Amino acid sequence: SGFRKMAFPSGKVEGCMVQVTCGTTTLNGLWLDDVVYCPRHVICTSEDMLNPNYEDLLIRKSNHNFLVQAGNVQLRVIGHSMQNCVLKLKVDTANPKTPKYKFVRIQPGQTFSVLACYNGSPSGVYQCAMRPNFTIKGSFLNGSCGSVGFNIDYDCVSFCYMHHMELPTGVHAGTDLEGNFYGPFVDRQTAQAAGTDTTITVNVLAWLYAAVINGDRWFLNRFTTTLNDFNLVAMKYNYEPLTQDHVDILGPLSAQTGIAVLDMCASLKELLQNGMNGRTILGSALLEDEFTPFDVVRQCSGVTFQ
Amino acid sequence: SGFRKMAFPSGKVEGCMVQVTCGTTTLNGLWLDDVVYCPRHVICTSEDMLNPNYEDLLIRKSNHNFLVQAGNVQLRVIGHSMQNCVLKLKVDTANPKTPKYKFVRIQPGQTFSVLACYNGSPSGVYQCAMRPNFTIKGSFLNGSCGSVGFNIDYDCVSFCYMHHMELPTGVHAGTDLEGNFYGPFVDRQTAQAAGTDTTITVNVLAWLYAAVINGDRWFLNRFTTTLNDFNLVAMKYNYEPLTQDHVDILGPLSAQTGIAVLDMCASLKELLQNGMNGRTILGSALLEDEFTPFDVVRQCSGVTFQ
Ligand SMILES: O=C(c1cc(=O)[nH]c(=O)[nH]1)N1CCN(c2cc(Cl)c(Cl)c(Cl)c2)CC1
Ligand SMILES: O=C(c1cc(=O)[nH]c(=O)[nH]1)N1CCN(c2cc(Cl)c(Cl)c(Cl)c2)CC1
């Protein structure tokens, strides 16, 4: 038992991290087979930051403008191209530690692990969720660009995020690995702001199920509600509305605890109206929304990976 | 910026995890050079659980009673011995992925990363603290025994914890890698309970410094206190007392924020007496005590590892 903010083991990703330098700018790249992927803003200088023309900046570069280092070994850049907001650097050597991988775009509310890196060197791993406003609440310092987010599905690493920038509110924005931004953000140093965030309701419910599994039961009651009555209260508190699809997703947790989803929704409705009254749930005094139903099952039932 | 519960990258440890079977019992082992380390209770059956005589149980075994698998490859056990509460299995092949390592015993209040494993397969990584009562609040299911805790110091993995059991309150207990238990626990299925826990004060202060660095300032004030006046209030709230050594440890964070430790202590004293009043600090509504001063510096300044 117990319940922690748990990330995926990062070994398979650590072997893909490289350092990319172009000019006076160094950041992180992702080396899979013979391609290194990195944010295209590595080719900007201080003059182009505010309004870069990336096609112009890239035409003015040659392969030898790009220094790629995998620890000590130097990788020779033999070609380069741009795919949306990522740069693809073709190198002379295929990464022998390339795992089975795919590129996937995730949806708001889903979680992934972040391998924070500096100078091509992995520094830490942590778990976060894609927020409904398409930002993540990450932990990143100067030099972290090109760090990646990923899930592990059996033996296969699913890359879903590459880090590009920090917004003024301290939250983070980036792209999928095909270079398409999450959210309405652009890779230029203008003043952009995230839209208003909401709480991920299906995730709060999954976490309450995790609490019941771990012996936290004080918030339960024998009332039941309907989808439409619950969604009416949720809207007032800036909670995402609950769909029948969400109810089905919560099936395994309802089955294992014998508490129906709409029963659990009645508990959540009370918590939103009366608060917690100085009581905690799984060691938190706030309702937690960064665990998916799958995260809970994985941690309260125990799937491994190859 | 930002602040997350961040673990060390686990790659260097993942390559050391093996599966150990003896009889109908399978659990995890740690393979370094030509020795596999695992909890000695792998040699118990249901009859010996309540009061095992480990010297008797071990004499009745031969090398071929122990099945060790590193994924698919079978490792041949050519010798075995007991060191306190761990079993040391000598095998025919030295682990080619052995990192630079050492065995260290940590103190209450220090943090480490846990690589939770099942059947020799790494499942997740998370960060926790050794509590003052020598337990950890882990996340572990059936089959997790032999999972290890570790820190990374530059290029060197410092192993500090091997998982042995879950106590009745849902918290976890284990040994250092020389087999000596943390706390007054024994590897037998008697009813043992952890003593009362306290809050790790120096860690709460470090976290308040992390908050200031990330722009959370609402709890500050211009009062100052003394060590002895603060410790008087802390005792009443089940907080560990604060030593001059703790003050010195917090030096770098005082320097970077320009707020003296005893100034910060005056803020903490107010938070303990008036509560949080529905305000949060770094996204928490409770005071967090599982980040050391070193964790904060590492995350709010940015050390990598080789
Ligand atoms: O390393 C960080 C960083 C990341 C983070 O998450 N937090 C943080 O404090 N610093 N940089 C800030 C973003 N920088 C940048 C540069 C250009 Cl030229 C463009 Cl065009 C754009 Cl969009 C962004 C690169 C450097
Ligand atoms: O896998 C887990 C486990 C770990 C955990 O953290 N949580 C959890 O639910 N289960 N086991 C419980 C402890 N078991 C055991 C067996 C013997 Cl024979 C002795 Cl003597 C002792 Cl001390 C302990 C081994 C199996």
XYZ file of C-alpha atoms and ligand atoms in Angstrom:
662
model
C 0.000 0.000 0.000
C 0.817 3.724 -0.052
C 0.453 6.286 -2.811
C 3.231 8.440 -4.302
C 3.781 10.763 -7.257
C 5.517 8.053 -9.249
C 7.396 8.514 -12.540
C 8.384 5.902 -15.088
C 11.926 4.508 -14.887
C 13.990 6.733 -17.120
C 16.887 4.477 -18.175
C 15.622 3.930 -21.729
C 15.410 7.685 -22.275
C 18.668 8.686 -20.537
C 20.647 6.918 -23.262
C 19.036 9.100 -25.925
C 19.905 12.490 -24.467
C 22.587 14.557 -26.225
C 23.895 18.076 -26.119
C 23.327 20.376 -29.091
C 25.282 23.584 -29.609
C 24.807 26.134 -32.370
C 26.768 29.339 -31.868
C 26.765 30.508 -28.264
C 23.574 28.518 -27.494
C 23.601 25.011 -26.018
C 20.563 22.902 -25.166
C 19.376 19.308 -25.106
C 18.564 17.034 -28.003
C 16.971 13.623 -28.411
C 19.007 11.114 -30.443
C 17.045 8.212 -31.957
C 18.523 6.095 -34.781
C 20.556 8.652 -36.808
C 18.408 11.760 -36.118
C 18.819 14.283 -33.307
C 15.660 16.251 -32.435
C 15.804 19.615 -30.667
C 13.875 22.915 -30.424
C 14.409 25.015 -33.526
C 14.990 28.141 -31.427
C 18.547 26.869 -30.909
C 19.324 28.705 -34.187
C 18.169 32.101 -32.854
C 20.389 34.855 -31.499
C 19.385 37.794 -29.317
C 18.559 39.825 -32.435
C 16.026 37.314 -33.808
C 14.261 36.427 -30.561
C 11.403 38.841 -30.821
C 10.381 38.038 -34.434
C 12.471 35.269 -35.964
C 12.172 34.110 -39.552
C 13.197 30.507 -39.100
C 13.453 29.722 -42.821
C 15.914 32.537 -43.242
C 17.888 31.606 -40.148
C 18.166 27.984 -41.258
C 19.250 28.662 -44.852
C 22.193 30.662 -43.481
C 23.518 27.643 -41.632
C 25.648 24.678 -42.611
C 26.047 21.279 -40.971
C 29.268 22.355 -39.239
C 27.414 25.173 -37.453
C 25.858 22.423 -35.262
C 27.919 20.775 -32.521
C 26.347 17.569 -31.156
C 27.984 15.755 -28.228
C 26.860 12.455 -26.697
C 28.818 12.749 -23.468
C 32.366 12.786 -24.822
C 31.826 11.372 -28.319
C 31.228 13.945 -31.047
C 28.483 13.219 -33.565
C 29.043 14.502 -37.091
C 26.059 16.390 -38.510
C 25.608 15.352 -42.149
C 22.260 17.073 -42.791
C 19.576 19.201 -41.225
C 15.942 20.114 -41.741
C 13.037 21.698 -39.921
C 9.759 19.970 -39.089
C 7.382 22.606 -37.752
C 8.985 23.815 -34.489
C 11.635 21.106 -34.152
C 14.977 20.834 -35.901
C 15.959 17.389 -37.206
C 19.744 16.933 -37.339
C 20.850 13.934 -39.386
C 24.068 12.482 -37.926
C 26.599 9.932 -39.155
C 25.988 7.358 -36.391
C 22.749 5.677 -35.366
C 22.189 5.562 -31.617
C 22.913 1.949 -30.571
C 20.764 2.497 -27.460
C 17.661 3.465 -29.470
C 14.689 1.810 -27.715
C 11.497 0.767 -29.356
C 9.676 4.129 -29.527
C 6.797 6.043 -31.011
C 5.675 9.667 -31.184
C 2.247 10.331 -29.673
C 0.299 13.497 -28.954
C -1.397 13.418 -25.575
C -4.666 15.077 -24.464
C -5.280 17.482 -21.591
C -5.646 15.507 -18.398
C -3.178 12.790 -19.292
C 0.055 12.386 -17.334
C 3.634 11.699 -18.358
C 7.128 11.603 -16.926
C 9.626 14.395 -17.595
C 13.362 13.766 -17.723
C 14.826 17.186 -16.918
C 18.251 17.572 -18.517
C 21.077 20.129 -18.690
C 23.936 20.049 -21.227
C 22.706 16.685 -22.440
C 23.003 15.296 -18.910
C 19.892 13.884 -17.146
C 19.286 15.662 -13.818
C 15.926 14.450 -12.456
C 12.660 12.718 -13.268
C 9.168 13.783 -12.253
C 5.527 13.219 -13.102
C 3.111 15.860 -14.344
C -0.176 16.322 -16.215
C -0.975 18.215 -19.400
C -3.294 20.936 -18.037
C -6.634 21.800 -19.712
C -5.047 25.080 -20.861
C -2.248 23.089 -22.629
C 0.537 24.087 -20.257
C 2.366 21.911 -17.751
C 3.415 22.893 -14.231
C 6.991 21.719 -14.624
C 10.253 22.361 -12.825
C 12.830 23.753 -15.253
C 15.805 26.126 -15.073
C 17.882 27.883 -17.723
C 19.305 25.267 -20.100
C 16.455 22.733 -19.842
C 15.076 23.219 -23.386
C 14.883 19.990 -25.360
C 14.106 17.926 -22.238
C 11.425 15.376 -23.097
C 8.253 13.909 -21.651
C 7.361 10.273 -22.136
C 5.253 7.308 -21.128
C 6.268 3.652 -21.208
C 3.852 1.155 -22.760
C 5.272 -2.331 -22.090
C 8.636 -2.238 -23.898
C 7.875 0.896 -25.937
C 8.711 4.505 -25.037
C 5.968 6.890 -26.197
C 7.496 10.355 -26.480
C 4.853 13.055 -26.082
C 6.523 16.344 -25.118
C 9.630 18.390 -25.817
C 10.316 21.440 -23.664
C 10.556 24.873 -25.396
C 9.850 27.743 -22.976
C 8.587 29.065 -19.669
C 5.616 31.424 -19.717
C 5.492 34.540 -17.499
C 3.304 32.853 -14.866
C 5.993 30.228 -14.310
C 4.277 27.419 -16.227
C 5.786 25.623 -19.193
C 4.982 25.088 -22.835
C 6.301 22.892 -25.584
C 5.530 20.717 -28.552
C 4.890 17.143 -29.464
C 7.808 15.390 -31.196
C 6.471 16.293 -34.650
C 7.035 19.909 -33.622
C 3.420 21.031 -33.157
C 2.839 23.172 -30.104
C 0.453 22.168 -27.371
C -1.833 25.167 -26.947
C -1.868 28.500 -28.808
C 1.805 29.323 -28.214
C 4.586 30.243 -30.638
C 8.378 29.947 -30.320
C 9.178 33.625 -30.188
C 9.836 35.810 -27.179
C 6.627 37.740 -27.243
C 4.354 38.080 -24.204
C 1.993 35.114 -24.352
C -0.240 33.988 -21.525
C -2.002 30.739 -20.775
C -5.778 30.767 -20.685
C -7.586 29.983 -17.467
C -7.024 26.508 -16.094
C -9.678 24.115 -14.787
C -9.517 21.111 -12.453
C -9.462 17.676 -14.125
C -12.546 16.057 -12.572
C -12.058 12.485 -13.753
C -8.584 12.583 -12.173
C -9.910 13.864 -8.821
C -12.350 10.929 -8.777
C -9.573 8.419 -9.546
C -7.566 9.851 -6.628
C -10.545 9.503 -4.265
C -10.714 5.853 -5.329
C -6.984 5.531 -4.529
C -7.755 6.978 -1.089
C -10.501 4.438 -0.421
C -8.158 1.637 -1.484
C -5.592 2.947 1.019
C -8.101 3.186 3.884
C -9.137 6.862 3.691
C -12.947 6.631 3.870
C -14.144 9.595 5.950
C -15.561 11.546 2.965
C -17.908 8.791 1.789
C -21.705 8.952 2.195
C -24.658 6.912 0.967
C -26.132 9.550 -1.331
C -26.057 9.217 -5.113
C -26.341 11.846 -7.839
C -26.831 12.026 -11.605
C -24.341 13.181 -14.214
C -26.341 16.340 -14.897
C -26.793 17.305 -11.247
C -23.092 16.763 -10.558
C -21.974 18.665 -13.673
C -24.145 21.574 -12.521
C -22.161 21.917 -9.290
C -18.810 21.180 -10.958
C -19.220 24.071 -13.434
C -19.567 26.526 -10.548
C -16.238 25.399 -9.066
C -14.231 25.467 -12.351
C -14.199 21.681 -12.665
C -14.232 20.010 -16.065
C -17.618 18.409 -16.805
C -17.944 14.663 -16.427
C -18.855 12.516 -19.432
C -20.221 8.993 -19.666
C -16.852 8.053 -21.171
C -15.185 9.170 -17.933
C -17.612 6.999 -15.960
C -16.666 3.945 -18.043
C -12.945 4.685 -17.638
C -13.425 4.605 -13.847
C -14.987 1.120 -14.122
C -12.093 -0.952 -12.761
C -11.824 1.284 -9.687
C -15.569 1.147 -9.009
C -15.394 -2.653 -9.348
C -12.424 -3.083 -6.991
C -13.946 -0.871 -4.260
C -17.644 -1.622 -4.800
C -18.465 2.111 -4.849
C -20.350 3.362 -7.902
C -19.009 6.379 -9.777
C -22.175 8.415 -9.198
C -21.880 7.473 -5.523
C -18.324 8.828 -5.501
C -19.551 11.935 -7.341
C -21.913 12.645 -4.449
C -18.905 12.609 -2.097
C -16.992 14.984 -4.372
C -20.003 17.313 -4.497
C -19.977 17.530 -0.678
C -16.217 18.160 -0.582
C -16.599 21.028 -3.053
C -19.378 22.664 -0.995
C -18.211 22.127 2.608
C -14.460 21.849 2.063
C -12.162 19.467 3.892
C -12.636 20.866 7.417
C -8.989 20.386 8.335
C -8.996 16.698 7.400
C -6.578 15.252 4.798
C -6.913 12.685 2.024
C -3.791 10.637 1.185
C -1.701 13.212 3.022
C -3.087 16.169 1.056
C -5.321 19.001 2.255
C -6.366 19.830 -1.341
C -8.056 17.701 -3.979
C -5.376 16.302 -6.295
C -6.000 16.157 -10.043
C -2.719 14.924 -11.564
C -3.343 11.156 -11.320
C -5.306 9.485 -14.139
C -7.472 6.400 -13.607
C -4.629 4.457 -15.248
C -1.994 5.885 -12.877
C -4.086 4.712 -9.906
C -4.638 1.182 -11.235
C -0.935 0.884 -12.100
C 0.074 1.907 -8.574
C -2.756 0.152 -6.652
C -2.546 -3.162 -8.613
C 0.999 -3.174 -9.931
C 1.907 -3.299 -13.642
C 5.611 -3.572 -14.570
C 7.282 -2.899 -17.938
C 9.750 -4.537 -20.331
C 11.192 27.931 -12.133
C 8.650 25.549 -10.585
C 9.045 22.962 -7.854
C 8.301 19.227 -8.127
C 8.860 16.041 -6.134
C 11.851 15.075 -8.244
C 13.684 11.728 -8.174
C 17.133 10.889 -9.476
C 17.367 9.347 -12.953
C 17.229 5.623 -12.392
C 19.055 4.207 -15.435
C 22.223 3.274 -13.533
C 20.181 1.273 -11.030
C 17.747 -0.369 -13.484
C 20.619 -2.373 -14.968
C 21.384 -3.898 -11.571
C 17.943 -5.288 -10.797
C 17.467 -9.069 -10.953
C 14.868 -11.586 -9.940
C 15.626 -14.032 -7.131
C 13.594 -17.181 -6.546
C 14.016 -19.689 -3.740
C 11.235 -22.257 -3.531
C 7.811 -20.761 -4.161
C 9.041 -17.246 -3.229
C 10.264 -14.711 -5.789
C 11.489 -11.193 -5.068
C 13.996 -8.625 -6.274
C 17.752 -8.640 -5.932
C 20.544 -6.161 -6.563
C 23.386 -7.446 -8.764
C 26.712 -5.605 -8.434
C 29.963 -7.165 -9.714
C 29.460 -10.912 -9.015
C 27.228 -10.613 -5.904
C 23.432 -10.504 -5.778
C 21.971 -8.880 -2.641
C 18.428 -9.601 -1.460
C 16.366 -9.797 1.761
C 17.182 -12.948 3.691
C 13.487 -13.652 4.294
C 13.405 -15.083 0.761
C 14.490 -18.365 2.424
C 11.443 -18.494 4.737
C 8.292 -20.524 4.189
C 4.899 -20.044 5.822
C 5.980 -22.273 8.720
C 9.032 -20.165 9.643
C 7.494 -16.710 9.261
C 6.527 -16.150 12.840
C 9.872 -17.152 14.439
C 12.507 -18.058 11.868
C 15.958 -19.351 12.721
C 17.847 -18.013 9.741
C 21.064 -19.930 10.447
C 19.144 -23.165 10.399
C 17.181 -22.242 7.296
C 20.345 -21.297 5.419
C 22.379 -24.400 6.307
C 19.604 -26.531 4.790
C 20.034 -24.876 1.419
C 22.387 -25.397 -1.493
C 23.361 -23.066 -4.324
C 20.889 -24.724 -6.705
C 17.996 -23.851 -4.373
C 18.433 -20.231 -5.593
C 17.190 -19.219 -9.044
C 18.539 -15.840 -10.214
C 17.332 -14.360 -13.515
C 18.552 -11.135 -15.131
C 15.684 -10.721 -17.571
C 16.119 -13.855 -19.671
C 19.708 -14.812 -18.820
C 20.109 -17.232 -15.922
C 22.858 -16.509 -13.407
C 24.521 -19.522 -11.811
C 24.774 -19.285 -8.021
C 28.205 -20.565 -6.968
C 28.051 -19.562 -3.287
C 25.901 -17.932 -0.659
C 26.230 -16.275 2.725
C 24.286 -14.088 5.113
C 25.311 -10.607 6.235
C 22.948 -9.557 9.011
C 19.505 -9.336 7.344
C 20.642 -9.572 3.722
C 21.602 -12.646 1.738
C 24.686 -12.363 -0.486
C 24.511 -14.713 -3.485
C 27.828 -15.154 -5.276
C 27.224 -15.734 -9.003
C 29.426 -16.865 -11.882
C 29.182 -13.626 -13.904
C 30.028 -10.084 -12.853
C 27.430 -7.513 -13.861
C 28.933 -5.632 -16.840
C 26.608 -2.701 -16.068
C 27.919 -2.276 -12.503
C 28.170 1.496 -11.897
C 30.550 3.170 -9.552
C 28.734 2.636 -6.225
C 29.001 2.753 -2.474
C 26.908 1.630 0.488
C 25.878 4.432 2.846
C 23.556 4.587 5.832
C 21.378 7.678 5.815
C 19.962 9.663 8.769
C 16.353 10.541 9.560
C 15.362 13.572 7.545
C 17.437 12.755 4.497
C 15.772 11.941 1.178
C 16.436 9.328 -1.479
C 14.915 7.890 -4.624
C 13.186 4.499 -4.623
C 13.129 2.268 -7.687
C 10.059 0.097 -7.097
C 10.462 -3.266 -8.820
C 8.474 -6.475 -9.374
C 9.960 -9.774 -10.608
C 13.258 -8.018 -11.189
C 11.532 -5.517 -13.478
C 11.636 -1.768 -12.634
C 8.106 -0.328 -12.372
C 8.412 3.258 -11.085
C 10.648 5.791 -9.379
C 9.728 8.157 -6.566
C 11.277 10.348 -3.902
C 10.816 9.944 -0.163
C 12.388 10.816 3.197
C 13.604 8.599 6.020
C 11.158 9.584 8.791
C 12.328 10.407 12.350
C 10.769 7.105 13.474
C 12.959 5.216 10.913
C 10.132 4.250 8.577
C 9.445 5.538 5.080
C 6.047 6.383 3.599
C 6.568 4.371 0.436
C 4.325 2.936 -2.248
C 4.804 -0.831 -2.471
C 2.655 -3.847 -3.367
C 3.131 -7.589 -2.932
C 6.391 -8.615 -4.618
C 8.305 -5.353 -4.065
C 10.802 -6.709 -1.491
C 14.414 -6.138 -2.484
C 13.596 -2.833 -4.222
C 16.317 -0.315 -3.397
C 16.701 3.320 -2.425
C 19.593 5.401 -3.674
C 21.127 8.813 -4.184
C 23.443 9.878 -6.996
C 26.599 11.799 -6.085
C 28.190 12.944 -9.368
C 28.949 9.645 -11.137
C 28.498 7.454 -8.047
C 25.328 5.659 -6.922
C 25.025 5.643 -3.118
C 22.716 2.786 -2.157
C 21.042 3.442 1.190
C 17.910 1.290 1.494
C 16.604 -2.155 0.632
C 12.902 -2.861 1.095
C 11.876 -5.683 3.509
C 8.309 -5.230 4.797
C 5.194 -3.147 5.289
C 4.124 -2.364 8.843
C 0.454 -2.530 9.917
C -0.039 1.242 9.610
C 0.876 1.065 5.928
C 4.400 2.468 6.276
C 7.539 0.649 5.209
C 10.696 -0.645 6.809
C 13.967 -2.019 5.575
C 17.704 -2.150 5.970
C 20.829 -0.509 4.724
C 22.818 -2.571 2.199
C 24.967 -4.106 4.948
C 21.740 -5.651 6.231
C 21.206 -3.547 9.366
C 17.635 -2.459 9.917
C 16.647 1.169 10.111
C 14.703 1.459 13.356
C 13.881 -1.207 15.963
C 12.343 -3.690 13.516
C 13.098 -7.360 12.871
C 12.484 -9.535 9.795
C 9.839 -11.779 11.264
C 6.083 -11.555 10.944
C 5.344 -10.415 14.433
C 3.227 -7.341 15.203
C 5.651 -4.424 15.297
C 4.652 -0.784 15.275
C 6.510 2.389 14.441
C 6.999 4.918 17.204
C 5.421 8.334 16.923
C 6.618 10.442 14.025
C 7.637 14.107 14.136
C 7.876 16.800 11.455
C 11.364 17.480 10.052
C 11.757 21.191 10.835
C 14.909 21.933 8.858
C 13.154 20.498 5.786
C 10.043 22.667 6.284
C 12.316 25.731 6.384
C 14.117 24.682 3.181
C 10.720 24.330 1.469
C 9.662 27.817 2.609
C 12.878 29.098 1.029
C 11.936 27.252 -2.190
C 8.567 29.025 -2.037
C 10.168 32.456 -1.712
C 12.442 31.666 -4.655
C 9.346 30.768 -6.699
C 7.460 33.947 -5.750
C 5.334 32.729 -2.813
C 5.933 35.457 -0.206
C 2.628 35.994 1.621
C 3.754 34.270 4.858
C 6.793 36.487 5.435
C 6.964 39.146 8.175
C 9.661 41.385 9.624
C 9.837 39.757 13.049
C 12.828 37.705 14.170
C 13.143 35.051 16.869
C 15.871 33.131 18.693
C 16.653 29.432 18.464
C 15.374 28.822 21.991
C 12.120 30.739 21.557
C 11.409 28.956 18.274
C 12.277 25.510 19.665
C 9.839 26.185 22.512
C 6.934 26.559 20.081
C 8.141 23.752 17.795
C 8.117 21.197 20.646
C 4.426 21.883 21.264
C 3.574 21.084 17.633
C 5.643 17.846 17.382
C 8.366 19.489 15.304
C 11.977 18.379 15.601
C 14.091 20.968 17.444
C 16.333 23.224 15.403
C 20.099 23.151 15.930
C 22.803 25.634 15.004
C 24.020 23.007 12.529
C 20.647 23.217 10.772
C 20.995 27.004 10.603
C 24.399 26.676 8.910
C 23.048 24.093 6.449
C 20.383 26.618 5.387
C 23.122 29.189 4.641
C 23.047 29.067 0.833
C 19.269 29.560 0.805
C 19.429 32.486 3.238
C 22.158 34.027 1.056
C 20.257 33.626 -2.227
C 17.018 35.116 -0.827
C 18.472 37.612 1.660
C 16.169 36.309 4.419
C 17.878 35.195 7.625
C 17.064 31.767 9.043
C 15.775 33.196 12.329
C 13.647 35.564 10.245
C 12.198 32.571 8.395
C 11.688 30.814 11.742
C 9.450 33.681 12.842
C 7.286 33.061 9.758
C 7.103 29.339 10.531
C 6.116 30.120 14.125
C 3.158 32.184 12.851
C 2.101 29.452 10.409
C 2.086 26.892 13.224
C -0.087 29.106 15.463
C -2.561 30.661 12.995
C -2.546 28.010 10.272
C -2.670 28.700 6.556
C -6.116 30.350 6.433
C -7.028 28.703 3.141
C -3.905 29.969 1.373
C -1.403 27.589 -0.294
C 2.383 27.472 -0.515
C 3.878 25.930 -3.682
C 0.510 24.349 -4.411
C 0.217 22.698 -0.987
C -2.196 23.478 1.845
C 0.063 21.706 4.387
C 3.666 22.347 5.366
C 5.887 19.935 3.429
C 8.836 18.272 5.160
C 10.272 15.837 2.589
C 12.672 18.223 0.803
C 16.148 18.719 2.310
C 18.119 21.955 1.946
C 20.178 20.086 -0.666
C 17.091 19.010 -2.645
C 15.995 22.661 -2.850
C 19.386 23.984 -3.984
C 19.658 21.191 -6.568
C 16.234 22.046 -7.999
C 16.406 25.868 -7.615
C 20.004 26.220 -8.958
C 20.444 23.133 -11.098
C 23.121 20.471 -10.497
C 23.421 17.629 -13.045
C 25.204 14.272 -12.673
C 27.671 12.071 -14.562
O 16.568 27.549 -20.837
C 15.598 28.321 -20.833
C 14.530 28.120 -19.786
C 13.520 27.216 -19.869
C 12.548 27.127 -18.791
O 11.590 26.348 -18.751
N 12.755 28.015 -17.746
C 13.767 28.960 -17.653
O 13.875 29.720 -16.703
N 14.640 28.983 -18.720
N 15.395 29.297 -21.735
C 14.248 30.209 -21.777
C 13.586 30.105 -23.139
N 14.585 30.424 -24.183
C 14.116 30.796 -25.441
C 15.001 31.322 -26.404
C 14.532 31.698 -27.654
Cl 15.669 32.358 -28.822
C 13.191 31.574 -28.004
Cl 12.632 32.057 -29.584
C 12.321 31.048 -27.040
Cl 10.632 30.867 -27.456
C 12.753 30.661 -25.777
C 15.746 29.552 -24.165
C 16.390 29.546 -22.784
O 5.842 -8.342 -1.032
C 5.479 -8.076 0.122
C 5.002 -6.675 0.416
C 5.813 -5.616 0.672
C 5.226 -4.314 0.947
O 5.855 -3.280 1.192
N 3.839 -4.285 0.925
C 2.993 -5.359 0.688
O 1.777 -5.257 0.700
N 3.631 -6.557 0.443
N 5.529 -8.934 1.157
C 5.132 -8.646 2.538
C 6.304 -8.938 3.458
N 6.711 -10.350 3.283
C 7.462 -10.942 4.295
C 7.689 -12.333 4.293
C 8.433 -12.922 5.305
Cl 8.684 -14.662 5.267
C 8.975 -12.178 6.347
Cl 9.905 -12.948 7.606
C 8.745 -10.796 6.338
Cl 9.428 -9.831 7.628
C 8.005 -10.170 5.342
C 7.096 -10.680 1.922
C 5.986 -10.312 0.945
